[PDB]
Design an enzyme around this catalytic site. Structure first.
Site, PDB file in Angstrom:
ATOM      1  N   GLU A   1       0.697  -0.818   0.044  1.00 23.45           N
ATOM      2  CA  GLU A   1      -0.206  -0.059  -0.139  1.00 23.45           C
ATOM      3  C   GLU A   1       0.313   1.151   0.413  1.00 23.45           C
ATOM      4  O   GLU A   1       0.437   2.148  -0.484  1.00 23.45           O
ATOM      5  CB  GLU A   1      -1.136   0.031   1.000  1.00 23.45           C
ATOM      6  CG  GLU A   1      -1.964  -1.006   1.183  1.00 23.45           C
ATOM      7  CD  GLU A   1      -2.990  -1.105   0.380  1.00 23.45           C
ATOM      8  OE1 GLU A   1      -3.465   0.167  -0.104  1.00 23.45           O
ATOM      9  OE2 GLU A   1      -3.660  -2.711   0.026  1.00 23.45           O
TER      10      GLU A   1
ATOM     11  N   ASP B   1      -6.847   6.297  -5.165  1.00 24.43           N
ATOM     12  CA  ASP B   1      -5.915   5.009  -4.887  1.00 24.43           C
ATOM     13  C   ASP B   1      -6.471   4.471  -6.502  1.00 24.43           C
ATOM     14  O   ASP B   1      -6.842   4.767  -8.096  1.00 24.43           O
ATOM     15  CB  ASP B   1      -6.978   3.934  -3.848  1.00 24.43           C
ATOM     16  CG  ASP B   1      -8.439   3.450  -4.475  1.00 24.43           C
ATOM     17  OD1 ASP B   1      -9.189   4.168  -6.047  1.00 24.43           O
ATOM     18  OD2 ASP B   1      -8.949   2.701  -3.531  1.00 24.43           O
TER      19      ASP B   1
ATOM     20  N   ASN C   1      -7.525 -20.549 -10.050  1.00 26.42           N
ATOM     21  CA  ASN C   1      -8.675 -20.131  -9.809  1.00 26.42           C
ATOM     22  C   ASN C   1      -9.209 -18.826  -9.081  1.00 26.42           C
ATOM     23  O   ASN C   1      -9.595 -17.495  -9.900  1.00 26.42           O
ATOM     24  CB  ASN C   1      -9.574 -20.586  -9.255  1.00 26.42           C
ATOM     25  CG  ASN C   1     -10.737 -20.421  -8.851  1.00 26.42           C
ATOM     26  OD1 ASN C   1     -11.291 -19.756  -7.961  1.00 26.42           O
ATOM     27  ND2 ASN C   1     -11.649 -20.995  -9.998  1.00 26.42           N
TER      28      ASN C   1
ATOM     29  N   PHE D   1      -8.115  -6.581   3.612  1.00 30.41           N
ATOM     30  CA  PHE D   1      -7.656  -5.609   3.476  1.00 30.41           C
ATOM     31  C   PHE D   1      -8.358  -4.627   2.351  1.00 30.41           C
ATOM     32  O   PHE D   1      -8.459  -3.925   1.987  1.00 30.41           O
ATOM     33  CB  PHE D   1      -6.599  -5.537   3.625  1.00 30.41           C
ATOM     34  CG  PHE D   1      -6.328  -4.010   4.832  1.00 30.41           C
ATOM     35  CD1 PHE D   1      -5.401  -2.912   3.395  1.00 30.41           C
ATOM     36  CD2 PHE D   1      -5.976  -3.424   5.703  1.00 30.41           C
ATOM     37  CE1 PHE D   1      -4.664  -1.674   4.062  1.00 30.41           C
ATOM     38  CE2 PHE D   1      -4.951  -2.427   5.695  1.00 30.41           C
ATOM     39  CZ  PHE D   1      -4.920  -1.589   5.033  1.00 30.41           C
TER      40      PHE D   1
ATOM     41  N   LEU E   1      -9.585   4.173   3.149  1.00 30.58           N
ATOM     42  CA  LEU E   1     -10.291   4.724   2.387  1.00 30.58           C
ATOM     43  C   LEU E   1     -10.877   5.664   3.202  1.00 30.58           C
ATOM     44  O   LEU E   1     -11.390   5.445   4.257  1.00 30.58           O
ATOM     45  CB  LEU E   1     -10.865   3.146   1.992  1.00 30.58           C
ATOM     46  CG  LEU E   1     -12.600   3.846   0.643  1.00 30.58           C
ATOM     47  CD1 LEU E   1     -11.388   4.444  -0.033  1.00 30.58           C
ATOM     48  CD2 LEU E   1     -13.278   2.338   0.517  1.00 30.58           C
TER      49      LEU E   1
ATOM     50  N   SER F   1     -12.539 -20.555  -5.352  1.00 30.11           N
ATOM     51  CA  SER F   1     -10.982 -20.539  -4.372  1.00 30.11           C
ATOM     52  C   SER F   1     -11.039 -20.686  -3.088  1.00 30.11           C
ATOM     53  O   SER F   1     -10.495 -21.416  -2.712  1.00 30.11           O
ATOM     54  CB  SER F   1     -10.604 -18.572  -4.679  1.00 30.11           C
ATOM     55  OG  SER F   1     -11.009 -18.258  -5.122  1.00 30.11           O
TER      56      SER F   1
HETATM   57  C1  LIG Z   1      -9.241 -16.723  -1.261  1.00 26.49           C
HETATM   58  C2  LIG Z   1      -9.766 -15.240   0.109  1.00 26.49           C
HETATM   59  C3  LIG Z   1      -9.854 -14.155   0.896  1.00 26.49           C
HETATM   60  C4  LIG Z   1      -9.986 -13.830   1.860  1.00 26.49           C
HETATM   61  C5  LIG Z   1      -9.969 -14.118   3.147  1.00 26.49           C
HETATM   62  C6  LIG Z   1     -10.172 -16.269   2.625  1.00 26.49           C
HETATM   63  I1  LIG Z   1      -9.834 -17.043   4.528  1.00 26.49           I
HETATM   64  C7  LIG Z   1      -9.672 -16.826   1.833  1.00 26.49           C
END
Ligand SMILES: Cc1cccc(I)c1
Ligand SMILES: [Cl-]
Length: 162
Positions: free
Chosen positions: A11, A20, A132, A104, A32, A117
């Site tokens: 960041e 941003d 993915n 975040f 933000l 995912s």
């Molecule tokens: C891919 C992902 C994103 C945020 C939090 C998690 I646990 C997993």
């Protein structure tokens, strides 16, 4: 390395209001302020967050305290979320940092599209999860950031940040 060092790299640090990658008013270490196009609205949000009349500028100490609050809020968001918590608890400490990093950046509900995912990560299918995760607006809009985070999920090491 830890989550604070990782996000500080991703960041940066700016002590005056900036925009941003999506054009939203931000300050400090990626804090933000508002999605409104009004700079006056952003300045009001800043004063409310810091507790003084800042006129758009903060100190390094103020930026670091906001950052601590924001990381804390991301962790709490994961822990309160019935879909995210079991995946987070299944991960080792390095991969947990990659999860916090995504929350975040995109918020607890911005990661809502990553259902497939999440399942692959819980099953520890790291290469499949990496592919993915890359099939996303996230990867296509901020590819260098996404590559670092994905590599951390894939390997469980800090190599992308070293
Ligand atoms: C891919 C992902 C994103 C945020 C939090 C998690 I646990 C997993
Ligand atoms: Cl990027």
């Amino acid at each position: 390395m830890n989550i604070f060092e990782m996000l500080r790299i991703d960041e940066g640090l700016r002590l005056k209001i900036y925009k941003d990658t999506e054009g939203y008013y931000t300050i400090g270490i990626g804090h933000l302020l508002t999605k409104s196009p009004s700079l006056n609205a952003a300045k009001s949000e800043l004063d409310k967050a810091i507790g003084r009349n800042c006129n758009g500028v903060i100190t390094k100490d103020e930026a670091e305290k906001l950052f601590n609050q924001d990381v804390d809020a991301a962790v709490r968001g994961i822990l309160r979320n019935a879909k995210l918590k079991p995946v987070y608890d299944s991960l080792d400490a390095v991969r947990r940092c990659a999860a916090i990093n995504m929350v975040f950046q995109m918020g607890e509900t911005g990661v809502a599209g990553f259902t497939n995912s999440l399942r692959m990560l819980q099953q520890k299918r790291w290469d499949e999860a990496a592919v993915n995760l890359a099939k996303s607006r996230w990867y296509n809009q901020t590819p260098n950031r996404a590559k670092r985070v994905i590599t951390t999920f894939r390997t469980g090491t800090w190599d992308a940040y070293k």
